[PDB]
Amino acid sequence: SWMSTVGGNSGGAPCVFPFTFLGNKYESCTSAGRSDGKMWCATTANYDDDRKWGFCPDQG
């Protein structure tokens, strides 16, 4: 990916795909756990454990 994160709380850590959130494997960004609109990505292989996340990069 070579992409740092925004949002979240990683501080600019690359999204690790596929990342599993709340039971599902995410190969792309997600809006899971969010009821706003900003999509994010986990910065760890298994989010359920590490729970380290960050918003999705350029979605262009």
Side-chain angles (χ1 to χ4, degrees):
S1 56
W2 201 293
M3 298 178 180
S4 304
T5 45
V6 13
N9 60 181
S10 33
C15 317
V16 179
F17 292 111
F19 68 95
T20 297
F21 189 65
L22 280 49
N24 303 292
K25 299 174 65 187
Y26 301 73
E27 299 154 353
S28 42
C29 300
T30 184
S31 48
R34 310 206 58 72
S35 294
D36 32 78
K38 304 71 169 295
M39 305 180 177
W40 57 289
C41 61
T43 61
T44 58
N46 185 287
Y47 188 102
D48 281 355
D49 288 305
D50 282 298
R51 306 227 285 189
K52 292 142 190 171
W53 66 296
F55 287 176
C56 193
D58 180 60
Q59 301 182 301

Coordinates of all heavy atoms in Angstrom, one line a residue:
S1 N 0.8 -1.2 0.0 CA 0.0 0.0 0.0 C 0.9 1.3 0.0 O 0.7 2.2 -0.8 CB -0.9 0.0 1.2 OG -0.1 -0.2 2.4
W2 N 1.8 1.3 0.9 CA 2.7 2.5 1.1 C 1.9 3.7 1.3 O 2.2 4.8 0.8 CB 3.6 2.6 -0.2 CG 4.8 3.4 0.0 CD1 5.0 4.7 0.3 CD2 6.2 2.9 -0.1 NE1 6.3 5.1 0.4 CE2 7.1 4.0 0.2 CE3 6.7 1.7 -0.4 CZ2 8.4 3.8 0.1 CZ3 8.1 1.5 -0.4 CH2 8.9 2.6 -0.1
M3 N 0.9 3.6 2.2 CA 0.0 4.7 2.5 C -0.2 4.9 4.0 O -0.6 3.9 4.7 CB -1.4 4.5 1.8 CG -1.3 4.5 0.3 SD -2.9 4.2 -0.5 CE -2.4 4.1 -2.2
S4 N 0.1 6.1 4.5 CA -0.1 6.4 5.9 C -1.5 6.7 6.2 O -2.3 7.0 5.3 CB 0.8 7.5 6.3 OG 2.2 7.3 6.0
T5 N -1.9 6.6 7.4 CA -3.3 6.8 7.8 C -3.6 8.3 8.3 O -2.6 9.0 8.7 CB -3.8 5.9 8.9 OG1 -2.8 5.7 9.9 CG2 -4.1 4.5 8.3
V6 N -4.8 8.6 8.3 CA -5.4 9.8 8.8 C -6.4 9.5 9.8 O -6.8 8.3 9.8 CB -5.9 10.7 7.6 CG1 -6.1 9.8 6.3 CG2 -7.3 11.3 7.9
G7 N -6.9 10.3 10.6 CA -7.9 9.9 11.6 C -7.3 8.8 12.5 O -6.1 8.9 12.8
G8 N -8.2 7.9 12.9 CA -7.8 6.8 13.8 C -6.9 7.2 15.0 O -7.2 8.2 15.6
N9 N -5.9 6.4 15.3 CA -5.0 6.7 16.4 C -3.6 6.1 16.2 O -2.9 5.9 17.2 CB -5.7 6.3 17.7 CG -6.0 4.8 17.9 OD1 -6.5 4.4 18.9 ND2 -5.7 4.1 16.9
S10 N -3.3 5.7 15.0 CA -2.1 5.0 14.7 C -0.9 6.0 14.6 O 0.2 5.8 15.0 CB -2.2 4.2 13.4 OG -3.0 4.9 12.5
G11 N -1.2 7.2 14.0 CA -0.3 8.2 13.9 C 0.3 8.2 12.5 O 1.4 8.8 12.3
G12 N -0.3 7.5 11.6 CA 0.2 7.5 10.2 C 0.8 6.1 9.9 O 1.9 6.0 9.4
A13 N 0.1 5.1 10.3 CA 0.5 3.7 10.0 C -0.2 3.1 8.8 O -1.3 3.3 8.6 CB 0.3 2.8 11.3
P14 N 0.6 2.4 8.0 CA 0.0 1.7 6.8 C -1.1 0.8 7.1 O -1.0 0.0 8.0 CB 1.2 1.0 6.2 CG 2.4 1.6 6.8 CD 2.0 2.1 8.2
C15 N -2.2 0.8 6.3 CA -3.3 -0.1 6.5 C -2.9 -1.5 6.2 O -2.4 -1.7 5.1 CB -4.5 0.3 5.6 SG -4.9 2.1 5.5
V16 N -3.1 -2.4 7.1 CA -2.8 -3.8 6.8 C -3.9 -4.6 6.3 O -4.9 -4.8 7.0 CB -2.3 -4.5 8.1 CG1 -1.9 -6.0 7.9 CG2 -1.1 -3.8 8.7
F17 N -3.8 -5.0 5.0 CA -4.9 -5.8 4.4 C -4.4 -7.2 4.1 O -3.3 -7.5 3.8 CB -5.3 -5.2 3.1 CG -5.9 -3.8 3.2 CD1 -5.3 -2.7 2.8 CD2 -7.2 -3.7 3.7 CE1 -5.9 -1.4 2.9 CE2 -7.8 -2.5 3.8 CZ -7.1 -1.3 3.4
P18 N -5.3 -8.2 4.4 CA -6.7 -8.0 4.8 C -6.8 -7.8 6.3 O -6.2 -8.6 7.1 CB -7.5 -9.2 4.4 CG -6.4 -10.1 3.7 CD -5.1 -9.6 4.2
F19 N -7.5 -6.8 6.8 CA -7.7 -6.6 8.2 C -9.0 -7.1 8.7 O -10.0 -6.8 8.1 CB -7.4 -5.2 8.7 CG -8.5 -4.2 8.2 CD1 -9.5 -3.9 9.1 CD2 -8.4 -3.6 7.0 CE1 -10.5 -3.0 8.7 CE2 -9.4 -2.7 6.6 CZ -10.4 -2.4 7.4
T20 N -9.1 -7.9 9.7 CA -10.4 -8.4 10.2 C -10.9 -7.5 11.3 O -10.3 -7.3 12.4 CB -10.3 -9.8 10.7 OG1 -9.9 -10.6 9.6 CG2 -11.5 -10.3 11.2
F21 N -12.1 -6.9 11.0 CA -12.8 -6.1 12.0 C -14.1 -6.8 12.4 O -14.9 -7.1 11.6 CB -13.2 -4.7 11.4 CG -13.7 -3.7 12.4 CD1 -12.9 -3.2 13.4 CD2 -15.0 -3.2 12.3 CE1 -13.3 -2.2 14.3 CE2 -15.5 -2.3 13.1 CZ -14.6 -1.8 14.1
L22 N -14.3 -6.8 13.7 CA -15.5 -7.3 14.3 C -16.0 -8.6 13.7 O -17.2 -8.9 13.6 CB -16.5 -6.2 14.2 CG -16.4 -5.1 15.2 CD1 -15.0 -4.6 15.4 CD2 -17.3 -4.0 14.9
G23 N -15.0 -9.5 13.2 CA -15.4 -10.8 12.6 C -15.2 -10.9 11.1 O -15.3 -12.0 10.6
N24 N -15.1 -9.7 10.4 CA -15.0 -9.8 8.9 C -13.6 -9.4 8.4 O -13.0 -8.6 9.0 CB -16.0 -8.9 8.3 CG -17.5 -9.2 8.8 OD1 -18.0 -10.2 8.4 ND2 -18.0 -8.3 9.5
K25 N -13.2 -10.0 7.3 CA -11.9 -9.7 6.7 C -12.1 -8.6 5.8 O -12.9 -8.7 4.8 CB -11.4 -11.0 6.0 CG -11.2 -12.2 6.8 CD -10.9 -13.4 6.0 CE -9.6 -13.2 5.3 NZ -9.3 -14.3 4.3
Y26 N -11.4 -7.5 6.0 CA -11.5 -6.3 5.1 C -10.3 -6.2 4.2 O -9.2 -6.0 4.7 CB -11.7 -5.1 5.9 CG -12.9 -5.1 6.8 CD1 -13.0 -5.9 7.9 CD2 -14.0 -4.4 6.5 CE1 -14.1 -5.9 8.7 CE2 -15.2 -4.4 7.3 CZ -15.2 -5.2 8.4 OH -16.3 -5.2 9.2
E27 N -10.5 -6.3 2.9 CA -9.5 -6.3 1.9 C -9.4 -4.8 1.4 O -8.4 -4.5 0.8 CB -9.9 -7.2 0.8 CG -10.0 -8.7 1.3 CD -10.9 -9.5 0.4 OE1 -11.6 -8.9 -0.5 OE2 -11.0 -10.7 0.6
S28 N -10.4 -4.1 1.7 CA -10.4 -2.7 1.3 C -10.8 -1.9 2.6 O -11.0 -2.4 3.6 CB -11.5 -2.5 0.2 OG -12.6 -3.2 0.5
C29 N -10.9 -0.5 2.4 CA -11.3 0.3 3.6 C -12.7 -0.1 4.0 O -13.5 -0.7 3.2 CB -11.2 1.8 3.2 SG -9.5 2.3 2.8
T30 N -13.1 0.4 5.2 CA -14.4 0.1 5.7 C -14.9 1.3 6.4 O -14.2 2.2 6.8 CB -14.4 -1.1 6.7 OG1 -15.7 -1.4 7.1 CG2 -13.5 -0.8 7.9
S31 N -16.2 1.3 6.7 CA -16.8 2.4 7.5 C -17.4 1.7 8.7 O -18.3 2.3 9.4 CB -17.9 3.1 6.6 OG -18.7 2.2 6.0
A32 N -16.9 0.5 9.0 CA -17.3 -0.3 10.2 C -17.1 0.4 11.5 O -16.1 1.1 11.6 CB -16.6 -1.6 10.1
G33 N -18.0 0.3 12.4 CA -17.9 1.0 13.7 C -18.1 2.5 13.6 O -18.1 3.1 14.6
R34 N -18.4 3.0 12.4 CA -18.6 4.4 12.2 C -20.1 4.6 11.7 O -20.5 3.9 10.8 CB -17.6 5.0 11.2 CG -16.2 4.7 11.5 CD -15.3 5.7 11.0 NE -15.6 7.0 11.5 CZ -15.3 7.4 12.8 NH1 -14.7 6.5 13.6 NH2 -15.6 8.6 13.2
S35 N -20.7 5.7 12.2 CA -22.1 6.0 11.8 C -22.1 7.4 11.2 O -23.1 8.1 11.2 CB -23.0 5.9 13.0 OG -23.1 4.5 13.4
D36 N -20.9 7.9 10.8 CA -20.8 9.2 10.2 C -20.7 9.1 8.7 O -21.7 9.3 8.0 CB -19.6 9.9 10.8 CG -18.4 9.0 11.1 OD1 -17.7 8.5 10.2 OD2 -18.3 8.7 12.3
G37 N -19.5 8.8 8.2 CA -19.3 8.7 6.8 C -17.8 8.4 6.5 O -17.5 7.8 5.4
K38 N -16.9 8.9 7.3 CA -15.5 8.7 7.1 C -15.1 7.2 7.1 O -15.3 6.6 8.1 CB -14.7 9.5 8.2 CG -15.1 10.9 8.3 CD -16.4 11.2 8.9 CE -16.6 12.7 9.2 NZ -15.7 13.1 10.3
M39 N -14.6 6.7 6.0 CA -14.1 5.4 6.0 C -12.7 5.3 6.5 O -11.9 6.2 6.4 CB -14.2 4.8 4.6 CG -15.6 5.0 3.9 SD -15.7 4.3 2.2 CE -17.4 4.6 1.8
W40 N -12.4 4.1 7.1 CA -11.1 3.9 7.7 C -10.5 2.6 7.2 O -11.0 1.9 6.3 CB -11.1 4.0 9.2 CG -12.1 3.0 9.8 CD1 -13.4 3.0 9.7 CD2 -11.7 1.8 10.5 NE1 -14.0 2.0 10.4 CE2 -12.9 1.2 10.9 CE3 -10.5 1.3 10.9 CZ2 -12.9 0.0 11.6 CZ3 -10.5 0.1 11.6 CH2 -11.7 -0.5 11.9
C41 N -9.4 2.2 7.9 CA -8.7 0.9 7.7 C -7.9 0.6 8.9 O -7.5 1.4 9.7 CB -7.7 1.1 6.5 SG -6.4 2.4 6.9
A42 N -7.7 -0.7 9.2 CA -7.0 -1.1 10.3 C -5.5 -1.1 10.0 O -5.1 -1.4 8.9 CB -7.4 -2.5 10.8
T43 N -4.7 -0.8 11.0 CA -3.3 -0.8 10.8 C -2.6 -2.1 11.3 O -1.4 -2.1 11.4 CB -2.7 0.5 11.4 OG1 -3.0 0.4 12.8 CG2 -3.4 1.7 10.9
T44 N -3.4 -3.0 11.6 CA -3.0 -4.3 12.1 C -3.7 -5.4 11.3 O -4.8 -5.2 10.9 CB -3.2 -4.4 13.6 OG1 -4.5 -4.3 13.9 CG2 -2.4 -3.4 14.4
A45 N -3.1 -6.6 11.2 CA -3.7 -7.7 10.5 C -5.1 -8.1 11.2 O -6.1 -8.2 10.5 CB -2.8 -8.9 10.5
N46 N -5.1 -8.2 12.5 CA -6.3 -8.5 13.2 C -6.6 -7.3 14.1 O -5.9 -7.0 15.1 CB -6.1 -9.8 14.1 CG -7.3 -10.2 14.8 OD1 -7.8 -9.6 15.7 ND2 -8.0 -11.3 14.3
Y47 N -7.7 -6.6 13.7 CA -8.1 -5.5 14.5 C -8.7 -5.8 15.8 O -8.6 -5.1 16.8 CB -9.0 -4.6 13.6 CG -9.4 -3.3 14.2 CD1 -8.8 -2.1 13.8 CD2 -10.3 -3.1 15.3 CE1 -9.1 -0.9 14.3 CE2 -10.6 -1.9 15.8 CZ -10.0 -0.8 15.4 OH -10.2 0.4 15.9
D48 N -9.5 -6.9 15.8 CA -10.2 -7.4 17.0 C -9.2 -7.4 18.2 O -9.7 -7.2 19.4 CB -10.7 -8.8 16.8 CG -12.0 -8.8 16.0 OD1 -12.5 -7.7 15.7 OD2 -12.6 -9.9 15.7
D49 N -8.0 -7.7 18.0 CA -7.0 -7.8 19.1 C -6.3 -6.4 19.3 O -6.4 -5.9 20.4 CB -5.9 -8.8 18.8 CG -6.5 -10.2 18.9 OD1 -7.0 -10.6 20.0 OD2 -6.3 -11.0 18.0
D50 N -5.5 -6.0 18.3 CA -4.8 -4.7 18.5 C -5.6 -3.5 18.5 O -5.3 -2.5 19.2 CB -3.8 -4.6 17.3 CG -2.6 -5.5 17.5 OD1 -1.8 -5.2 18.4 OD2 -2.4 -6.4 16.7
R51 N -6.8 -3.5 17.8 CA -7.7 -2.4 17.7 C -7.0 -1.0 17.4 O -7.3 0.0 18.0 CB -8.5 -2.3 19.0 CG -9.2 -3.6 19.3 CD -10.6 -3.5 19.6 NE -10.8 -3.0 21.0 CZ -12.0 -3.0 21.6 NH1 -13.1 -3.4 20.9 NH2 -12.1 -2.5 22.8
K52 N -6.1 -1.1 16.4 CA -5.4 0.1 16.0 C -5.9 0.4 14.6 O -5.9 -0.4 13.7 CB -3.9 -0.1 16.0 CG -3.4 -0.3 17.4 CD -2.3 -1.3 17.5 CE -1.9 -1.6 19.0 NZ -1.0 -2.7 19.2
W53 N -6.5 1.6 14.4 CA -7.1 2.0 13.2 C -6.6 3.4 12.7 O -6.0 4.1 13.4 CB -8.6 2.0 13.4 CG -9.1 3.0 14.3 CD1 -8.9 3.1 15.7 CD2 -10.0 4.0 14.0 NE1 -9.6 4.2 16.2 CE2 -10.2 4.8 15.1 CE3 -10.5 4.4 12.8 CZ2 -11.1 5.9 15.1 CZ3 -11.4 5.5 12.7 CH2 -11.6 6.2 13.9
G54 N -7.1 3.7 11.5 CA -6.8 4.9 10.8 C -7.7 5.1 9.6 O -8.0 4.1 8.9
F55 N -8.2 6.3 9.4 CA -9.0 6.6 8.2 C -8.4 6.2 6.9 O -7.2 6.1 6.8 CB -9.3 8.1 8.2 CG -10.3 8.6 9.3 CD1 -10.6 9.9 9.4 CD2 -10.9 7.6 10.1 CE1 -11.5 10.3 10.4 CE2 -11.8 8.1 11.1 CZ -12.1 9.4 11.2
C56 N -9.2 6.0 5.9 CA -8.8 5.6 4.6 C -8.1 6.7 3.9 O -8.5 7.9 4.0 CB -10.1 5.1 3.8 SG -9.7 4.2 2.2
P57 N -7.1 6.4 3.1 CA -6.3 7.5 2.3 C -7.1 8.0 1.2 O -8.4 8.1 1.2 CB -5.1 6.7 1.8 CG -5.7 5.3 1.6 CD -6.5 5.1 2.8
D58 N -6.4 8.4 0.1 CA -7.0 9.0 -1.1 C -8.0 8.0 -1.7 O -7.5 6.9 -2.2 CB -6.0 9.5 -2.1 CG -6.6 10.1 -3.3 OD1 -7.4 11.1 -3.2 OD2 -6.4 9.5 -4.4
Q59 N -9.3 8.3 -1.7 CA -10.2 7.4 -2.3 C -10.6 7.8 -3.8 O -11.7 7.6 -4.2 CB -11.5 7.4 -1.5 CG -11.3 6.9 -0.1 CD -12.5 6.8 0.8 OE1 -13.2 7.8 0.9 NE2 -12.8 5.6 1.3
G60 N -9.6 8.5 -4.4 CA -9.8 8.9 -5.8 C -9.7 7.8 -6.8 O -8.5 7.3 -6.9

